Coordinates of C-alpha atoms and ligand atoms in Angstrom, one line a residue:
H8 CA -18.5 -13.0 9.6
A9 CA -16.7 -15.4 7.0
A10 CA -13.3 -14.5 5.4
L11 CA -13.6 -13.5 1.6
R12 CA -11.7 -16.0 -0.6
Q13 CA -8.2 -15.0 -1.9
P14 CA -8.1 -16.2 -5.5
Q15 CA -4.7 -17.9 -6.2
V16 CA -2.6 -16.3 -9.0
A17 CA -3.6 -19.3 -11.3
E18 CA -7.4 -18.5 -11.0
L19 CA -6.8 -14.7 -11.6
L20 CA -4.4 -15.7 -14.5
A21 CA -6.9 -18.1 -16.2
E22 CA -9.5 -15.3 -15.9
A23 CA -7.1 -12.8 -17.4
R24 CA -6.0 -15.3 -20.1
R25 CA -9.7 -16.1 -21.1
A26 CA -10.7 -12.4 -21.3
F27 CA -7.5 -11.5 -23.4
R28 CA -8.3 -14.3 -25.9
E29 CA -11.9 -13.1 -26.3
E30 CA -10.9 -9.4 -26.6
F31 CA -7.8 -9.6 -28.9
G32 CA -8.4 -13.0 -30.7
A33 CA -5.0 -14.5 -29.6
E34 CA -3.4 -16.0 -26.4
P35 CA -1.4 -13.5 -24.4
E36 CA 2.4 -13.9 -24.6
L37 CA 3.1 -12.6 -21.0
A38 CA 1.7 -12.7 -17.4
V39 CA 2.8 -10.6 -14.4
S40 CA 1.5 -10.2 -10.9
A41 CA 2.0 -7.5 -8.1
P42 CA 0.3 -7.7 -4.7
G43 CA -1.4 -5.2 -2.5
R44 CA -0.1 -4.6 1.1
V45 CA -0.9 -4.3 4.8
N46 CA 1.4 -2.2 6.9
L47 CA 1.9 -4.1 10.3
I48 CA 3.3 -0.9 11.9
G49 CA 5.2 2.4 11.0
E50 CA 2.3 4.6 9.7
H51 CA 3.0 8.1 8.2
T52 CA 6.7 7.4 8.6
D53 CA 7.8 6.5 5.0
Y54 CA 7.6 10.2 3.7
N55 CA 9.4 11.3 7.0
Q56 CA 12.4 9.0 6.0
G57 CA 11.3 6.7 8.9
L58 CA 10.9 2.9 9.3
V59 CA 7.9 0.8 7.9
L60 CA 7.1 -2.9 8.4
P61 CA 4.6 -3.9 5.6
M62 CA 3.9 -7.4 4.2
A63 CA 2.6 -8.3 0.7
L64 CA -0.9 -9.9 0.5
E65 CA -2.3 -12.8 -1.6
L66 CA -4.7 -10.0 -2.9
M67 CA -2.9 -9.0 -6.2
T68 CA -3.3 -7.3 -9.6
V69 CA -2.5 -9.6 -12.7
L70 CA -1.8 -8.2 -16.1
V71 CA -1.6 -10.6 -19.2
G72 CA -0.5 -9.0 -22.5
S73 CA 1.5 -9.0 -25.7
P74 CA 3.7 -6.4 -27.4
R75 CA 2.2 -4.6 -30.5
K76 CA 4.1 -3.3 -33.7
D77 CA 1.9 -0.1 -34.1
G78 CA 3.1 2.0 -31.1
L79 CA -0.5 1.7 -29.6
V80 CA -1.6 0.8 -26.1
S81 CA -4.9 -1.1 -25.8
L82 CA -6.2 -2.0 -22.2
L83 CA -9.2 -3.9 -20.8
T84 CA -9.9 -4.3 -17.0
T85 CA -12.5 -6.7 -15.7
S86 CA -12.2 -5.1 -12.2
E87 CA -15.6 -4.4 -10.6
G88 CA -15.4 -0.8 -9.2
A89 CA -13.2 0.4 -12.1
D90 CA -14.8 3.6 -13.6
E91 CA -16.2 3.4 -17.2
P92 CA -15.1 2.7 -19.8
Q93 CA -13.4 -0.7 -19.0
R94 CA -11.4 -0.3 -22.3
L95 CA -9.0 2.5 -23.2
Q96 CA -6.6 2.8 -26.2
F97 CA -3.9 5.6 -26.6
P98 CA -0.7 6.1 -28.6
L99 CA 2.6 5.8 -26.7
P100 CA 4.0 9.1 -25.4
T101 CA 6.7 10.9 -27.5
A102 CA 8.9 14.0 -27.0
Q103 CA 6.2 15.9 -29.0
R104 CA 3.1 14.7 -27.0
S105 CA 3.1 13.2 -23.5
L106 CA 0.3 11.1 -21.9
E107 CA -2.3 13.0 -19.8
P108 CA -4.4 11.9 -16.7
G109 CA -8.2 11.8 -17.2
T110 CA -11.0 9.2 -17.6
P111 CA -11.2 6.4 -16.9
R112 CA -9.3 7.0 -13.6
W113 CA -8.0 3.4 -13.4
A114 CA -5.9 4.0 -16.7
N115 CA -4.2 7.0 -15.1
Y116 CA -2.1 4.4 -13.2
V117 CA -0.9 2.5 -16.4
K118 CA -0.4 5.9 -18.2
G119 CA 1.8 7.3 -15.4
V120 CA 4.1 4.2 -15.3
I121 CA 4.4 4.3 -19.1
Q122 CA 5.1 8.1 -19.1
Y123 CA 7.9 7.8 -16.5
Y124 CA 9.3 4.3 -17.8
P125 CA 13.1 5.0 -17.9
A126 CA 14.1 2.5 -20.7
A127 CA 13.6 2.7 -24.5
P128 CA 12.5 1.6 -27.0
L129 CA 9.1 0.8 -25.4
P130 CA 6.8 -0.9 -28.0
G131 CA 3.0 -0.6 -27.8
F132 CA 1.1 -3.6 -26.3
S133 CA -2.4 -5.1 -25.6
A134 CA -3.2 -6.0 -21.9
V135 CA -6.0 -7.3 -19.7
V136 CA -5.9 -6.1 -16.0
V137 CA -7.5 -8.2 -13.1
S138 CA -7.3 -7.5 -9.3
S139 CA -8.5 -9.2 -6.1
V140 CA -7.2 -6.1 -4.2
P141 CA -10.4 -4.2 -3.3
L142 CA -10.4 -0.8 -5.2
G143 CA -9.4 2.1 -3.0
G144 CA -10.2 0.0 0.2
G145 CA -6.8 0.7 1.9
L146 CA -4.6 -2.2 0.8
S147 CA -2.7 -0.3 -2.1
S148 CA -4.7 -1.4 -5.2
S149 CA -3.1 1.5 -7.1
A150 CA 0.5 0.5 -6.1
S151 CA -0.3 -3.1 -7.2
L152 CA -1.5 -1.8 -10.6
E153 CA 1.6 0.5 -11.0
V154 CA 4.0 -2.3 -10.0
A155 CA 2.3 -4.9 -12.3
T156 CA 2.5 -2.3 -15.1
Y157 CA 6.2 -1.7 -14.4
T158 CA 7.0 -5.5 -14.3
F159 CA 5.2 -5.8 -17.7
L160 CA 7.1 -3.0 -19.3
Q161 CA 10.3 -4.7 -18.1
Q162 CA 9.5 -7.7 -20.3
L163 CA 8.7 -5.3 -23.2
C164 CA 11.9 -3.3 -22.7
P165 CA 14.2 -4.4 -19.8
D166 CA 15.3 -1.5 -17.6
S167 CA 18.8 -1.6 -16.0
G168 CA 18.1 0.2 -12.6
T169 CA 17.6 -0.6 -8.9
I170 CA 14.3 -1.7 -7.2
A171 CA 14.2 1.7 -5.5
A172 CA 14.3 3.6 -8.9
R173 CA 11.4 1.3 -10.0
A174 CA 9.5 2.1 -6.9
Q175 CA 10.2 5.8 -7.5
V176 CA 8.8 5.6 -11.0
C177 CA 5.6 3.9 -9.7
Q178 CA 5.5 6.6 -7.0
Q179 CA 5.9 9.4 -9.7
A180 CA 2.8 7.9 -11.5
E181 CA 0.8 8.1 -8.3
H182 CA 1.9 11.7 -7.7
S183 CA 1.6 13.1 -11.3
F184 CA -1.2 10.9 -12.8
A185 CA -3.4 10.2 -9.6
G186 CA -2.7 13.4 -7.6
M187 CA -1.8 11.3 -4.4
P188 CA 1.7 12.3 -3.1
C189 CA 2.5 9.0 -1.5
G190 CA 5.7 7.9 0.1
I191 CA 7.6 4.8 -1.2
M192 CA 6.2 2.1 1.1
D193 CA 3.3 0.7 -1.1
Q194 CA 5.4 0.4 -4.3
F195 CA 8.5 -0.9 -2.5
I196 CA 6.5 -3.7 -0.6
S197 CA 4.7 -4.6 -3.9
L198 CA 8.1 -5.0 -5.6
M199 CA 10.1 -6.5 -2.7
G200 CA 7.6 -8.9 -0.9
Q201 CA 8.6 -12.5 -0.1
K202 CA 6.3 -15.3 1.1
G203 CA 6.5 -15.9 4.9
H204 CA 8.1 -12.5 5.5
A205 CA 7.3 -8.9 6.6
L206 CA 9.7 -6.3 5.0
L207 CA 11.4 -3.8 7.3
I208 CA 12.1 -0.7 5.1
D209 CA 14.4 2.1 6.1
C210 CA 12.9 5.0 4.1
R211 CA 16.0 7.1 4.7
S212 CA 18.8 4.6 3.6
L213 CA 16.4 2.5 1.5
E214 CA 18.0 -0.6 3.2
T215 CA 15.5 -3.6 3.4
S216 CA 15.4 -6.7 5.8
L217 CA 13.2 -9.8 5.3
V218 CA 11.5 -10.6 8.8
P219 CA 9.8 -14.1 9.3
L220 CA 6.0 -14.1 9.7
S221 CA 4.9 -17.8 9.0
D222 CA 4.0 -19.3 12.5
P223 CA 0.8 -21.5 12.2
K224 CA -0.3 -20.5 15.8
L225 CA -0.5 -16.8 14.6
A226 CA -2.7 -15.0 11.9
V227 CA -3.0 -11.5 10.5
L228 CA -6.7 -10.5 10.1
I229 CA -7.4 -7.5 7.8
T230 CA -10.8 -5.8 8.5
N231 CA -12.2 -3.4 5.8
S232 CA -14.4 -0.6 7.4
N233 CA -15.7 -0.4 3.7
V234 CA -15.7 3.4 4.4
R235 CA -13.4 6.2 2.9
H236 CA -13.9 9.8 4.1
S237 CA -12.8 12.5 1.6
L238 CA -10.0 13.5 4.1
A239 CA -8.3 10.2 3.1
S240 CA -7.4 12.2 -0.1
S241 CA -7.4 15.8 1.1
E242 CA -5.6 15.6 4.5
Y243 CA -2.8 13.2 3.2
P244 CA -0.9 16.2 1.6
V245 CA -1.7 18.4 4.6
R246 CA 0.2 16.0 7.0
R247 CA 3.1 15.9 4.6
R248 CA 3.3 19.8 4.8
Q249 CA 2.8 19.8 8.6
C250 CA 5.7 17.3 9.0
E251 CA 7.8 19.5 6.6
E252 CA 7.0 22.7 8.6
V253 CA 8.2 21.0 11.8
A254 CA 11.5 19.6 10.2
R255 CA 12.4 23.1 8.8
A256 CA 11.6 24.8 12.2
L257 CA 14.1 22.5 14.0
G258 CA 16.8 22.7 11.2
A259 CA 16.5 19.0 10.3
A260 CA 16.5 17.2 6.9
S261 CA 13.6 15.0 8.2
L262 CA 11.8 14.0 11.5
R263 CA 14.0 10.8 11.3
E264 CA 16.8 13.1 12.7
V265 CA 14.6 14.4 15.5
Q266 CA 14.1 12.7 19.0
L267 CA 11.2 13.3 21.5
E268 CA 13.7 15.2 23.8
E269 CA 14.9 17.5 20.9
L270 CA 11.2 18.0 19.9
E271 CA 9.9 18.8 23.5
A272 CA 12.8 21.4 23.9
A273 CA 11.6 23.2 20.7
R274 CA 7.8 23.2 21.7
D275 CA 7.7 27.0 21.1
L276 CA 9.3 26.8 17.6
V277 CA 6.2 24.9 16.2
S278 CA 2.3 25.0 16.4
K279 CA 0.2 22.8 18.8
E280 CA -1.0 20.4 16.0
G281 CA 2.6 20.6 14.5
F282 CA 4.0 19.3 17.8
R283 CA 1.3 16.5 17.9
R284 CA 2.1 15.5 14.2
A285 CA 5.9 15.2 15.1
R286 CA 5.3 13.4 18.4
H287 CA 3.5 10.6 16.5
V288 CA 6.3 10.3 13.8
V289 CA 9.3 10.2 16.2
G290 CA 7.3 7.7 18.4
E291 CA 6.2 5.5 15.4
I292 CA 9.8 5.3 14.1
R293 CA 11.0 4.1 17.6
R294 CA 7.9 1.7 17.9
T295 CA 8.7 0.2 14.4
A296 CA 12.3 -0.5 15.4
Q297 CA 10.9 -2.1 18.7
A298 CA 8.2 -4.1 16.7
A299 CA 10.8 -5.4 14.2
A300 CA 13.0 -6.6 17.2
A301 CA 9.9 -8.1 18.9
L302 CA 8.8 -10.0 15.8
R303 CA 12.3 -11.6 15.3
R304 CA 12.3 -13.1 18.8
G305 CA 8.7 -14.5 18.5
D306 CA 7.4 -11.9 21.0
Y307 CA 3.8 -11.4 19.5
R308 CA 2.5 -10.0 22.8
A309 CA 5.1 -7.2 22.7
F310 CA 4.4 -6.7 18.9
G311 CA 0.6 -6.4 19.6
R312 CA 1.1 -3.8 22.4
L313 CA 3.3 -1.7 20.0
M314 CA 0.5 -2.0 17.4
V315 CA -2.0 -0.6 20.0
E316 CA 0.3 2.4 20.9
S317 CA 0.6 3.1 17.1
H318 CA -3.2 3.3 16.8
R319 CA -3.5 5.6 19.8
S320 CA -0.8 7.8 18.5
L321 CA -2.5 7.9 15.0
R322 CA -5.9 8.6 16.7
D323 CA -4.8 11.3 19.2
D324 CA -1.6 12.9 17.8
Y325 CA -1.7 12.4 14.0
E326 CA -5.6 12.5 14.0
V327 CA -6.0 10.3 10.8
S328 CA -8.3 7.7 12.4
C329 CA -12.2 8.0 12.2
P330 CA -15.0 6.6 14.5
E331 CA -15.4 3.6 12.1
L332 CA -11.7 2.4 12.5
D333 CA -11.7 3.3 16.2
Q334 CA -14.8 1.1 16.8
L335 CA -13.2 -1.8 14.8
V336 CA -9.9 -1.6 16.8
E337 CA -11.8 -1.4 20.2
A338 CA -13.9 -4.4 19.1
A339 CA -10.8 -6.5 18.2
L340 CA -8.9 -5.7 21.5
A341 CA -11.9 -7.1 23.4
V342 CA -11.4 -10.6 21.8
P343 CA -9.3 -13.1 23.7
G344 CA -6.3 -14.4 21.5
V345 CA -5.9 -11.0 19.8
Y346 CA -2.4 -9.6 20.4
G347 CA -3.1 -6.1 18.9
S348 CA -5.1 -4.2 16.3
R349 CA -4.5 -0.8 14.5
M350 CA -5.6 1.2 11.5
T351 CA -3.3 0.5 8.5
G352 CA -2.7 2.8 5.5
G353 CA -3.4 6.5 5.2
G354 CA -6.4 6.5 7.5
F355 CA -9.9 8.2 7.5
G356 CA -11.3 4.8 6.5
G357 CA -9.8 1.7 4.8
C358 CA -8.6 -1.3 6.8
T359 CA -7.4 -2.3 10.3
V360 CA -4.8 -5.0 10.9
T361 CA -5.1 -7.5 13.8
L362 CA -2.4 -9.9 15.0
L363 CA -4.0 -12.9 16.8
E364 CA -3.8 -16.6 17.6
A365 CA -5.1 -18.3 14.4
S366 CA -7.6 -20.3 16.6
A367 CA -9.2 -16.9 17.6
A368 CA -9.8 -15.5 14.0
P369 CA -13.4 -16.9 13.7
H370 CA -14.4 -15.5 17.2
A371 CA -12.7 -12.2 16.3
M372 CA -14.6 -12.0 13.0
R373 CA -18.1 -12.6 14.6
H374 CA -17.4 -10.1 17.5
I375 CA -15.8 -7.3 15.3
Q376 CA -18.9 -7.6 12.9
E377 CA -21.5 -7.6 15.8
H378 CA -19.8 -4.6 17.5
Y379 CA -19.4 -2.6 14.1
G380 CA -22.0 0.1 13.1
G381 CA -21.3 -0.6 9.3
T382 CA -20.7 -3.8 7.3
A383 CA -17.1 -5.1 7.8
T384 CA -15.2 -7.3 5.2
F385 CA -12.5 -9.7 6.4
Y386 CA -9.2 -11.1 4.9
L387 CA -7.0 -13.7 6.7
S388 CA -3.7 -13.2 4.9
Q389 CA -0.3 -14.9 5.1
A390 CA 2.8 -12.9 4.0
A391 CA 3.1 -13.2 0.1
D392 CA 5.5 -12.8 -2.8
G393 CA 6.2 -9.4 -4.4
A394 CA 6.1 -8.8 -8.2
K395 CA 6.4 -12.0 -10.4
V396 CA 6.6 -12.9 -14.1
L397 CA 5.2 -16.1 -15.9
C398 CA 6.0 -16.6 -19.6
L399 CA 2.8 -17.9 -21.5
Ligands
LIG2 O1 -10.7 6.6 -6.8 C1 -9.7 6.2 -6.2 C2 -9.2 7.1 -5.0 C3 -8.5 6.3 -3.9 C4 -7.6 5.1 -4.4 C5 -8.3 4.3 -5.5 C6 -8.9 5.1 -6.7 C7 -9.6 4.1 -7.8 C8 -9.7 4.9 -9.1 C9 -10.3 4.1 -10.3 C10 -11.6 3.4 -9.9 C11 -11.5 2.7 -8.5 C12 -11.0 3.6 -7.4 N1 -8.7 2.9 -8.1 C13 -7.5 2.7 -7.2 N2 -6.7 1.5 -7.4 C14 -6.9 0.6 -8.4 N3 -7.8 0.8 -9.4 C15 -7.7 -0.3 -10.2 C16 -8.3 -0.8 -11.3 C17 -7.8 -2.0 -11.8 C18 -6.8 -2.7 -11.2 C19 -6.2 -2.3 -10.1 C20 -6.6 -1.1 -9.6 O2 -6.1 -0.5 -8.5 N4 -7.2 3.5 -6.0
LIG3 O1 1.7 5.0 6.5 C1 0.9 5.9 5.7 C2 1.0 5.4 4.3 O2 -0.2 6.0 3.7 C3 -0.2 5.2 2.5 O3 -1.4 4.8 2.1 C4 0.7 5.9 1.4 O4 0.4 5.5 0.1 C5 2.1 5.4 1.9 O5 3.2 5.9 1.1 C6 2.2 5.8 3.4 O6 2.4 7.2 3.5

């Protein structure tokens, strides 16, 4: 019932720097960071061209490296949880021979970003990878690794594209090298985060808006269920198809174009669970617009209520909660000073997010833990910077 330390960039950096020196016999030339994420509200909307309101965490991936002359890529990760081996070397992709997902799985993320990197000529490089983002724990550790990799390659071989195109490359790596067909939110927030802000993302227009979240009276408590059901992986793609089925049945580019009234009128053009999937999305888009407006005018009680409606919608209509997350959310809404709690991320495990009076965090942590059938982990996180570069 104490909050896990968030190592500052400097401490992850020093760790990365020391391990690079030992491994490659020289100081690294380059450092980059990319954070993980919590979604405050707007879940399972990004791939429906909806609205999301994520914020970057102090939990981050740091990559320190140097270009090579031999066209080789040599990687080391110190991340506990990374599958063996911790080291991998491979030649750069060419027109002849492209890179290929396999073992270790953590290198599929670097390989994917290298494979789809849009600028040339890319030299080889040596790199060490460290992360405080818990691996597969629901706060976008993969997006953080992809975005750190992309930022690194930018120093090796500057691209000339938009932040969206960069997000879309990281997203391509996730799809093609990790078999997770994600939307754009995780990569976009990892790129675009700013200290003291949430980011409202319009996943149709790709327009972004920085929204202040820096009030000392207020905290964001992230709770890790420290569970992941296999459905986290297998049912993600299923929901994407169900949403597509419903958009096609109504003659709509995306569920962004569909309102509840339009959806209710067409009940008999779609399945029962179809209709439930689409009721959540339409409702979550509306709620994210309302949450954004609420947050701007300091109305945390309204924000929290919209967080609770998002969870109920995800529980009952989208059916991507599990008993573990449900227990954690119920626990948190019992604590005075808590404005709202919901599951965040894909679901079927991972984290919940709780907006509360800062004074209440310790009482929330004790109570959530005591009421939770597993062992919860806690992060108290302010809104953090997106991808960053430090010349060494
Ligand atoms: O097995 C899964 C399925 C669900 C999502 C999750 C993966 C694994 C695959 C490799 C071993 C740990 C779990 N890793 C990530 N993310 C991540 N692994 C990293 C390694 C170093 C630095 C940053 C990293 O971010 N995502
Ligand atoms: O809100 C649900 C989210 O699930 C995420 O974990 C996925 O990577 C995102 O792109 C988004 O779809």
